[PDB]
Scaffold this active site. Structure first.
Site, PDB file in Angstrom:
ATOM      1  N   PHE A   1       0.871  -1.167   0.000  1.00 41.02           N
ATOM      2  CA  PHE A   1       0.000   0.000   0.000  1.00 41.02           C
ATOM      3  C   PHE A   1       0.918   1.230   0.000  1.00 41.02           C
ATOM      4  CE2 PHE A   1      -4.371   1.594   1.250  1.00 41.02           C
ATOM      5  CZ  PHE A   1      -5.129   0.658   0.559  1.00 41.02           C
TER       6      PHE A   1
ATOM      7  N   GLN B   1      -7.278  15.104   2.817  1.00 37.17           N
ATOM      8  CA  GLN B   1      -6.713  14.178   1.875  1.00 37.17           C
ATOM      9  C   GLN B   1      -7.576  14.027   0.613  1.00 37.17           C
ATOM     10  OE1 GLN B   1      -6.028   9.577   2.665  1.00 37.17           O
ATOM     11  NE2 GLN B   1      -4.099  10.781   2.772  1.00 37.17           N
TER      12      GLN B   1
ATOM     13  N   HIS C   1      -7.743  11.546  -2.160  1.00 39.44           N
ATOM     14  CA  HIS C   1      -7.328  10.251  -2.658  1.00 39.44           C
ATOM     15  C   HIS C   1      -7.005  10.391  -4.161  1.00 39.44           C
ATOM     16  CE1 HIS C   1      -7.167   6.002  -3.528  1.00 39.44           C
ATOM     17  NE2 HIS C   1      -7.341   5.722  -2.245  1.00 39.44           N
TER      18      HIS C   1
ATOM     19  N   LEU D   1     -14.672   5.805  -5.123  1.00 42.63           N
ATOM     20  CA  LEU D   1     -13.298   5.366  -4.929  1.00 42.63           C
ATOM     21  C   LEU D   1     -12.949   4.052  -5.631  1.00 42.63           C
ATOM     22  CD1 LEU D   1     -10.650   5.705  -3.189  1.00 42.63           C
ATOM     23  CD2 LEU D   1     -11.750   3.992  -1.619  1.00 42.63           C
TER      24      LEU D   1
ATOM     25  N   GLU E   1      -6.488   2.028  -3.373  1.00 46.82           N
ATOM     26  CA  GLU E   1      -5.056   2.095  -3.578  1.00 46.82           C
ATOM     27  C   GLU E   1      -4.486   0.669  -3.609  1.00 46.82           C
ATOM     28  OE1 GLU E   1      -3.049   5.348  -1.763  1.00 46.82           O
ATOM     29  OE2 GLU E   1      -1.813   4.072  -0.479  1.00 46.82           O
TER      30      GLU E   1
ATOM     31  N   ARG F   1      -0.023   9.739  -0.578  1.00 44.27           N
ATOM     32  CA  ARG F   1      -1.177  10.208  -1.387  1.00 44.27           C
ATOM     33  C   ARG F   1      -1.111  11.688  -1.782  1.00 44.27           C
ATOM     34  NH1 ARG F   1      -6.010   6.761   1.783  1.00 44.27           N
ATOM     35  NH2 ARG F   1      -5.565   4.868   0.585  1.00 44.27           N
TER      36      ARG F   1
ATOM     37  N   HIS G   1     -11.389  12.915   0.174  1.00 44.62           N
ATOM     38  CA  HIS G   1     -11.508  11.582   0.704  1.00 44.62           C
ATOM     39  C   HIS G   1     -11.532  11.500   2.230  1.00 44.62           C
ATOM     40  CE1 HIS G   1     -11.068   7.262   0.951  1.00 44.62           C
ATOM     41  NE2 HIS G   1      -9.920   7.380   1.600  1.00 44.62           N
TER      42      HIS G   1
ATOM     43  N   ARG H   1      -2.548  11.341   5.664  1.00 41.36           N
ATOM     44  CA  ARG H   1      -2.756  10.021   6.235  1.00 41.36           C
ATOM     45  C   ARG H   1      -2.259   8.916   5.299  1.00 41.36           C
ATOM     46  NH1 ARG H   1      -6.317   6.147   5.714  1.00 41.36           N
ATOM     47  NH2 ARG H   1      -8.068   7.229   4.691  1.00 41.36           N
TER      48      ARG H   1
HETATM   49  C1  LIG Z   1     -14.809   7.120   2.019  1.00 46.34           C
HETATM   50  C2  LIG Z   1     -13.846   5.964   2.115  1.00 46.34           C
HETATM   51  C3  LIG Z   1     -12.937   5.949   3.191  1.00 46.34           C
HETATM   52  C4  LIG Z   1     -12.043   4.900   3.376  1.00 46.34           C
HETATM   53  C5  LIG Z   1     -12.053   3.854   2.440  1.00 46.34           C
HETATM   54  C6  LIG Z   1     -12.955   3.866   1.348  1.00 46.34           C
HETATM   55  C7  LIG Z   1     -13.882   4.912   1.198  1.00 46.34           C
HETATM   56  C8  LIG Z   1     -14.854   4.881   0.031  1.00 46.34           C
HETATM   57  N1  LIG Z   1     -11.160   2.803   2.572  1.00 46.34           N
HETATM   58  C9  LIG Z   1     -10.280   2.793   3.646  1.00 46.34           C
HETATM   59  C10 LIG Z   1      -9.381   1.723   3.843  1.00 46.34           C
HETATM   60  O1  LIG Z   1      -9.352   0.758   3.072  1.00 46.34           O
HETATM   61  N2  LIG Z   1      -8.503   1.756   4.906  1.00 46.34           N
HETATM   62  C11 LIG Z   1      -8.500   2.788   5.798  1.00 46.34           C
HETATM   63  O2  LIG Z   1      -7.708   2.790   6.747  1.00 46.34           O
HETATM   64  N3  LIG Z   1      -9.404   3.815   5.622  1.00 46.34           N
HETATM   65  C12 LIG Z   1     -10.288   3.834   4.566  1.00 46.34           C
HETATM   66  N4  LIG Z   1     -11.139   4.900   4.434  1.00 46.34           N
HETATM   67  C13 LIG Z   1     -11.128   5.951   5.528  1.00 46.34           C
HETATM   68  C14 LIG Z   1     -11.917   5.353   6.683  1.00 46.34           C
HETATM   69  O3  LIG Z   1     -12.870   4.497   6.089  1.00 46.34           O
HETATM   70  C15 LIG Z   1     -12.806   6.338   7.389  1.00 46.34           C
HETATM   71  O4  LIG Z   1     -11.993   7.383   7.876  1.00 46.34           O
HETATM   72  C16 LIG Z   1     -13.475   5.640   8.569  1.00 46.34           C
HETATM   73  O5  LIG Z   1     -14.267   4.504   8.245  1.00 46.34           O
HETATM   74  C17 LIG Z   1     -14.267   6.590   9.445  1.00 46.34           C
HETATM   75  O6  LIG Z   1     -14.881   5.795  10.407  1.00 46.34           O
HETATM   76  P1  LIG Z   1     -15.543   6.466  11.646  1.00 46.34           P
HETATM   77  O7  LIG Z   1     -16.055   5.409  12.611  1.00 46.34           O
HETATM   78  O8  LIG Z   1     -14.705   7.600  12.218  1.00 46.34           O
HETATM   79  O9  LIG Z   1     -16.932   7.134  11.167  1.00 46.34           O
HETATM   80  P2  LIG Z   1     -17.948   6.555  10.099  1.00 46.34           P
HETATM   81  O10 LIG Z   1     -17.728   5.150   9.604  1.00 46.34           O
HETATM   82  O11 LIG Z   1     -17.849   7.559   8.984  1.00 46.34           O
HETATM   83  O12 LIG Z   1     -19.303   6.595  10.926  1.00 46.34           O
HETATM   84  C18 LIG Z   1     -19.773   7.813  11.449  1.00 46.34           C
HETATM   85  C19 LIG Z   1     -20.941   7.434  12.325  1.00 46.34           C
HETATM   86  O13 LIG Z   1     -21.410   8.610  12.948  1.00 46.34           O
HETATM   87  C20 LIG Z   1     -22.827   8.686  12.798  1.00 46.34           C
HETATM   88  N5  LIG Z   1     -23.260  10.086  12.839  1.00 46.34           N
HETATM   89  C21 LIG Z   1     -22.747  11.151  12.130  1.00 46.34           C
HETATM   90  N6  LIG Z   1     -23.426  12.276  12.495  1.00 46.34           N
HETATM   91  C22 LIG Z   1     -24.341  11.939  13.434  1.00 46.34           C
HETATM   92  C23 LIG Z   1     -25.271  12.672  14.146  1.00 46.34           C
HETATM   93  N7  LIG Z   1     -25.456  13.970  13.896  1.00 46.34           N
HETATM   94  N8  LIG Z   1     -26.081  12.034  15.066  1.00 46.34           N
HETATM   95  C24 LIG Z   1     -25.975  10.683  15.256  1.00 46.34           C
HETATM   96  N9  LIG Z   1     -25.029   9.985  14.551  1.00 46.34           N
HETATM   97  C25 LIG Z   1     -24.243  10.586  13.659  1.00 46.34           C
HETATM   98  C26 LIG Z   1     -23.131   7.991  11.495  1.00 46.34           C
HETATM   99  O14 LIG Z   1     -24.451   7.507  11.547  1.00 46.34           O
HETATM  100  C27 LIG Z   1     -22.108   6.854  11.534  1.00 46.34           C
HETATM  101  O15 LIG Z   1     -22.643   5.738  12.238  1.00 46.34           O
HETATM  102  O1  LIG Z   2      -7.472   3.139  -1.116  1.00 47.99           O
HETATM  103  C1  LIG Z   2      -8.183   2.583  -0.261  1.00 47.99           C
HETATM  104  O2  LIG Z   2      -8.564   1.391  -0.233  1.00 47.99           O
HETATM  105  C2  LIG Z   2      -8.606   3.399   0.923  1.00 47.99           C
HETATM  106  O3  LIG Z   2      -9.021   4.715   0.558  1.00 47.99           O
HETATM  107  C3  LIG Z   2      -7.591   3.357   2.071  1.00 47.99           C
HETATM  108  C4  LIG Z   2      -7.519   4.373   2.999  1.00 47.99           C
HETATM  109  O4  LIG Z   2      -6.785   4.171   3.992  1.00 47.99           O
HETATM  110  O5  LIG Z   2      -8.176   5.426   2.781  1.00 47.99           O
END
Ligand SMILES: *Cc1cc2c(cc1C)nc1c(=O)[nH]c(=O)nc-1n2C[C@H](O)[C@H](O)[C@H](O)COP(=O)(O)OP(=O)(O)OC[C@H]1O[C@@H](n2cnc3c(N)ncnc32)[C@H](O)[C@@H]1O
Ligand SMILES: O=C([O-])[C@H](O)C=C([O-])O
Ligand code: HEM
Ligand SMILES: CC1=C(C(=O)Nc2ccccc2)SCCO1
Ligand code: SF4
Ligand code: F3S
Ligand code: FES
Ligand code: NA
Lengths: 121, 588, 105, 238
Positions: B119, B240, B242, B252, B255, B286, B354, B399
């Site tokens: 990665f 970030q 992506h 997306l 990567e 990135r 991203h 990141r």
């Molecule tokens: C967008 C993305 C990010 C991503 C990825 C692929 C995509 C398409 N692949 C990744 C990967 O392979 N490896 C990695 O390390 N990171 C990757 N990313 C980034 C990462 O996924 C995200 O940063 C991460 O999943 C964020 O997780 P987190 O637990 O911090 O938050 P969430 O999954 O986005 O959930 C947010 C929760 O909060 C609730 N919410 C939001 N607002 C409210 C309010 N107002 N009231 C009540 N609840 C709220 C949402 O419902 C959700 O449950």
């Molecule tokens: O490229 C991905 O699979 C993804 O976007 C990974 C992070 O960590 O953000």
């Protein structure tokens, strides 16, 4: 209390589901038919006169139609029942493509058996 | 108290990876815990994560958490806090093995160990040969992770309030957070969730941009909530992009495509990353890859078509067998959203917003920080944050791929392990008065009463357009200054915006309007911060200040919500288990 | 339980299939159906036994099947129990009437 | 080009019963949008129109709908797949569940059936591994086709057996999840799980109708998973 969307006219059913509901209906019909066939078989076996009378009953055109329907529902229930069991025992695959294909073949086979049933009557 | 009150030891706002891991831990420590989520938990953005979890398991080759720490520190362009990165990298392997014991369906090496792929930003021996440390479940690792964590929460009987929208934090007269008001989306009921610990876990905010990889629900709710409560946010200029969103769609492609051997081509079929990052190539950081693509396009060497300007991500030389086994999800995404079969043809890609490196500053225990009038760190009693909403900071100015999912698990768990001490350290908190709770309803009552104002839809669009033109991959002082002026105007329109649906039963318009307030605060903080940081570092890149400036800017930027002004915070450079990594020039 | 129903329906399906092949076999190879050959067929030990075995199979197979149908479409308990009663009674009557018809031949 | 819709509306504080309402949308001739795009635009013009959505990329399972009669996800259903000359595009809630509001259904019964089959790893702790449980690629392949379920309920709400007994038949999605744990080589409670699936209703209400397979937006096959469960039940109880 909350409404639900269960309006059957608004939903698409693939051929496998048609095959399936007909298998259920043909089973129910056959359940009733057994009684009719037994009543008819009893009459045809009670004596020489019971037999001539069953033939006269079978001579009727309306009765030919019913008897044909019964034999068709039976044929259908049997064929599609066999299809079901072939899936259960691994002779037919349980993929959507195979399900479609085997349903169709099942309809063709049933049409043939329904024509042979017409003849026999 | 004229609102219903629901009381728990801990209230976790958000049920992505971080919130679900935290709730599970808090609950197993004997404390009552309410897990809130505005969507059903397994619909959180985590569910879309693809490539995997970066962690020194040492499966694909012998590894060392210090190599990972080094990659992370350098990757962050030296503003990641090194004590926090050390905790994360060292704690990581065991925290991730625990997910596998929960049943996470990781892919497998031949000897039965968890499969790890190369990665971006991974090396052996402190900057040596390319490493392979991202543990994966094909390319649906986020899906596998989130579903597993939800399953563990069922098993544990966690109290979950699904489809509840947290509105605003509740503070008491001493300035302590004592829970939040929330809206039940199904019934329209409004409630005060009273707690000794309120844990923001609300995720990112990519929807402040016109084009993002993020779910529609990524609206920065925790940033708006923190800001309206007087809590600062940190490093908000660090967004970030992506390198490989699908061109024309934003969706997306992982990567992991480059990790498995794919690479980027320009219109001449040059593998240009060999030029921009001679060592790591397509697996550079990135920020660097994203800039390099945009430089190719800017200079007439990008491709075009139905998709718009883009670079080509070539994968076909991997073969059908490797693609369908390691990257099946991106096969679906490319076919559906680009009308391109990666088995035969390159995927059209462009950098796309991203991930939010910024957020609520926190300790490793998850406790939220503010600063006093002297500029010293002080804990915000009663408030915690974990996951993408937090800025610990383990990610600094850029990141590394795979390090966010590691963060969610390591820090979600840590907040829960430390919760009893944090609660003991902060002492008993005074009760909110009714007027304190009432203050948390002002924003909601504004919308519920405004029938005749401005269309929220045009406001949201203007806001997205502003961020996309002015706070994108390449920035400039004049453009950012104007951008900031435009946002001030839009933010004024937003104060008179109307709610056209006043109903109470699953009224999504009300939720989208309330989210619009949080997009606005997040965008505003981002713009002020980006204007303020006069240097280029990781993802933040300025024509008028093209150089990294360690003398003035080796630090965090901090947005102070009461004065709407900026200040700076020290970066930690004092790891406990090995010596600091000194700042050095950063090239890939 | 459910495994028990599943097997019984299939075990009896196999027996009824054989019986149908037997009966159809006869019908499609007997030219003119004189009273004489008709009664000679049903007087045979083989036909009597097979027909009663078919009848028992039907009792089992159609009971499970009709129970499946009723438990899908008829919710009000009392109505359902009443319909099950009529149905079991009919199936048992089929068997007993069959005993009366063949032992009378 | 003008798109015509007929969309199911229901708000309990306003409507006595559900109704269909007609909508028009001007679309670009040279671009093919997803149904979710179209819905999002209809909501710009009618703020009261309520539906669930999130990822807009077919992964989150939020936006299951009955579209021209057939369940699927709005986010990956192209308008060109729905648009027939002289007909309206018909959008209705997933069948069989209570409707909360407009296109939003109460998924409560669907989740309850999922919880009933204990969808989490059960491992009795004997012979613990040194690090991760070791699982060979051949064992791990068995989860392919099962762990991808996004819980969108397109399958279950298209199943007649699930309509008639949503509280006793587990339904296709739930049984897919049961099978997922049944053949996980790290789950040691296989026999306990089969013992809980032996009644007349949990599994055996599946009649191979095959509505489930035809609609799954992820291309999964509950019917086949259900077949394998039935075999394991025979193997254990026959
Ligand atoms: C967008 C993305 C990010 C991503 C990825 C692929 C995509 C398409 N692949 C990744 C990967 O392979 N490896 C990695 O390390 N990171 C990757 N990313 C980034 C990462 O996924 C995200 O940063 C991460 O999943 C964020 O997780 P987190 O637990 O911090 O938050 P969430 O999954 O986005 O959930 C947010 C929760 O909060 C609730 N919410 C939001 N607002 C409210 C309010 N107002 N009231 C009540 N609840 C709220 C949402 O419902 C959700 O449950
Ligand atoms: O490229 C991905 O699979 C993804 O976007 C990974 C992070 O960590 O953000
Ligand atoms: C001859 C008298 C028969 C009667 C009265 C009868 C009646 C029924 C009924 C009422 C059902 C339940 C239908 C449902 O639940 O959908 C059924 C099911 C079934 N029948 Fe028959 N049947 C008869 C013979 C046969 C034969 C000869 C076969 C040959 C295979 C057969 C195969 C099956 C199978 C496999 C089922 C179960 C399908 C399922 O559970 O989904 N039946 N029958
Ligand atoms: C529940 C079930 C059937 C069913 O009810 N099918 C059906 C009913 C109404 C509309 C479509 C299909 S047919 C096969 C046996 O199982
Ligand atoms: S099996 Fe398919 S249709 Fe059913 S819930 Fe899972 S992803 Fe949706
Ligand atoms: S549609 Fe229903 S009956 Fe079985 S094959 Fe499917 S679960
Ligand atoms: S919006 Fe996530 S699957 Fe459609
Ligand atoms: Na962050």
């Amino acid at each position: 209390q909350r409404p639900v969307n269960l309006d059957l006219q608004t939903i698409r059913f693939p051929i496998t589901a048609i095959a399936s509901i007909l298998h259920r209906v043909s089973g129910v019909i056959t359940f009733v038919a057994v009684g009719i066939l037994l009543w008819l078989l009893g009459t045809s076996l009670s004596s020489p006169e019971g037999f001539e009378q069953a033939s006269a009953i079978m001579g009727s055109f309306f009765v030919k139609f019913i008897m044909w329907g019964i034999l068709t529902a039976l044929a259908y229930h049997v064929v599609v029942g066999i299809r079901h069991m072939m899936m259960d025992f691994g002779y037919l695959e349980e993929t959507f493509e195979a399900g479609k294909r085997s349903a169709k073949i099942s309809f063709v086979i049933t049409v043939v058996l329904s024509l042979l049933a017409g003849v026999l009557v | 108290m004229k609102l219903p009150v629901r009381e728990f030891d801990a209230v976790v706002i958000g049920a992505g990876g971080a919130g679900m891991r935290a709730a599970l831990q808090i609950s197993q420590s004997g404390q009552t815990c309410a897990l809130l989520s505005k969507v059903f938990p397994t619909r959180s953005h985590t569910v879309s994560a693809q490539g995997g979890i970066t962690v020194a398991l040492g499966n694909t080759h012998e590894d060392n958490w210090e190599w990972h720490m080094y990659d992370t520190v350098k990757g962050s362009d030296y503003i990641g806090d090194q004590d926090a990165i050390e905790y994360m990298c060292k704690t990581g392997p065991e925290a991730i093995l625990e997910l596998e014991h929960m049943g996470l369906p990781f892919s497998r090496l031949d000897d039965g160990r968890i499969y790890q792929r190369p990665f971006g930003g991974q090396s052996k021996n402190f900057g040596g040969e390319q490493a392979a440390r991202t543990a994966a479940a094909a390319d649906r690792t986020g899906h596998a992770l989130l579903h597993t964590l939800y399953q563990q929460n069922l098993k544990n009987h966690t109290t979950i309030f699904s489809e509840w929208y947290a509105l605003d934090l509740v503070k008491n007269q001493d300035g302590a957070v004592v829970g939040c008001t929330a809206l039940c989306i199904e019934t329209g009921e409004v409630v005060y969730f009273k707690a000794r610990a309120t844990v923001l876990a609300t995720g990112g905010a990519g929807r402040i941009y016109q084009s993002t990889t993020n779910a529609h629900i990524n609206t920065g709710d925790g940033v708006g909530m923190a800001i309206r409560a007087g809590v600062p946010v940190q490093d908000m200029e660090m967004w970030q992009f992506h390198p490989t969103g699908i061109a024309g769609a934003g969706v997306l492609v992982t990567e992991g495509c480059r990790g498995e051997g794919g690479y980027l081509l320009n219109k001449h079929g040059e593998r240009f990353m060999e030029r921009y990052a001679p060592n790591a190539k397509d697996l550079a950081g990135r920020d660097v890859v994203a800039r390099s693509i945009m430089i190719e396009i800017r200079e007439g060497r990008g491709c075009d078509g139905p998709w718009g300007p883009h670079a080509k991500l070539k994968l076909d030389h991997l073969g059908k067998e490797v693609l369908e086994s390691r990257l099946p999800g991106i096969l679906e995404l490319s076919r559906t959203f680009a009308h391109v079969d990666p088995v035969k043809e390159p995927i059209p890609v462009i950098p796309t917003c991203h991930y939010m490196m910024g957020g609520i500053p926190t300790k490793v225990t998850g406790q939220a920080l503010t600063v006093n009038e002297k500029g010293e760190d002080v804990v915000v009693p009663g408030l915690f944050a974990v996951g993408e909403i937090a800025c610990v900071s383990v990610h600094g100015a850029n990141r590394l791929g795979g390090n966010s999912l590691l963060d969610l698990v390591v820090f979600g768990r840590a907040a829960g392990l430390h919760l009893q001490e944090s609660i003991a350290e902060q002492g008993a908190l005074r009760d909110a008065s009714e007027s304190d709770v009432e203050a948390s309803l002002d924003r909601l009552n504004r919308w519920n009463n405004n029938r005749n104002g401005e269309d929220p839809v045009a406001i949201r669009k203007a806001l997205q357009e502003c961020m996309q033109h002015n706070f994108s991959v390449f920035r400039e002082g004049d453009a950012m200054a104007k951008g900031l002026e435009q946002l001030k105007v839009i933010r004024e329109r937003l104060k008179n915006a109307r709610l056209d649906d006043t109903s109470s039963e699953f009224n999504t318009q009300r939720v989208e309007c309330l989210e619009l307030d949080n997009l606005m605060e997040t965008a505003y903080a981002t713009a002020v911060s980006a204007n303020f940081r006069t240097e280029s570092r990781g993802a933040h890149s300025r024509f008028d200040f093209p150089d990294r400036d360690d003398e003035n800017w080796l630090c965090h930027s901090l947005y102070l919500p009461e004065s709407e002004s900026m200040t700076r915070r020290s970066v930690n450079m004092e790891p406990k288990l090995r010596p600091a990594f000194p700042p050095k020039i950063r090239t890939y | 339980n459910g495994v028990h129903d599943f097997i019984l329906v299939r075990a009896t399906a196999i027996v009824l299939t054989l019986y149908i092949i037997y009966m159809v076999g006869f019908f499609a190879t007997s030219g003119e159906l004189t009273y004489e050959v008709w009664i000679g067929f049903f007087a045979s030990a083989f036909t009597k036994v097979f027909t009663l075995l078919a009848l028992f199979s039907i009792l089992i197979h159609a009971w499970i099947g009709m129970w499946q149908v009723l438990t899908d479409y008829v919710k009000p308990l009392a109505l359902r129990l009443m319909l099950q009663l009529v149905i079991v009674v009919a199936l048992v009557v089929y068997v007993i009437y069959g005993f009366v018809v063949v032992w009378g031949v | 080009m003008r798109l015509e819709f007929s969309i199911y509306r229901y708000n309990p504080d306003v409507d006595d019963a559900p109704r269909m309402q007609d909508y028009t949308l001007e679309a670009d001739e040279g671009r093919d949008m997803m149904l979710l795009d179209a819905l999002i635009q209809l909501k710009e013009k009618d703020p009261s129109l309520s539906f669930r959505r999130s990822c807009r990329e077919g992964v989150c399972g939020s936006d299951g709908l009955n579209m021209n009669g057939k369940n699927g996800l709005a986010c990956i259903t192209p308008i060109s797949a729905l648009n027939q000359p002289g007909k309206k595009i018909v959008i209705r809630p997933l069948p069989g569940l209570p409707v909360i509001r407009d296109l939003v259904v109460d998924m409560g019964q669907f989740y309850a059936q999922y919880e009933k089959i204990k969808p989490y790893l059960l491992n009795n702790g004997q012979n613990p591994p040194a690090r991760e449980h070791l699982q060979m690629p051949e064992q791990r392949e068995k989860l392919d086709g099962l762990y991808e379920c996004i819980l969108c309920a397109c399958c279950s709400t298209s199943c007649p057996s699930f309509w008639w007994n949503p509280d006793k038949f587990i339904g296709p999605a739930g049984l897919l999840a049961a099978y997922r744990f049944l053949i996980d080589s790290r789950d040691t409670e296989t026999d306990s799980r089969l013992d809980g699936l032996s009644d007349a209703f949990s599994v055996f209400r599946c009649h191979s109708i095959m509505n489930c397979v035809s609609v799954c937006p992820k291309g999964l096959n509950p019917t086949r998973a259900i077949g394998h469960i039935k075999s394991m039940l025979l193997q254990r109880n026959a």
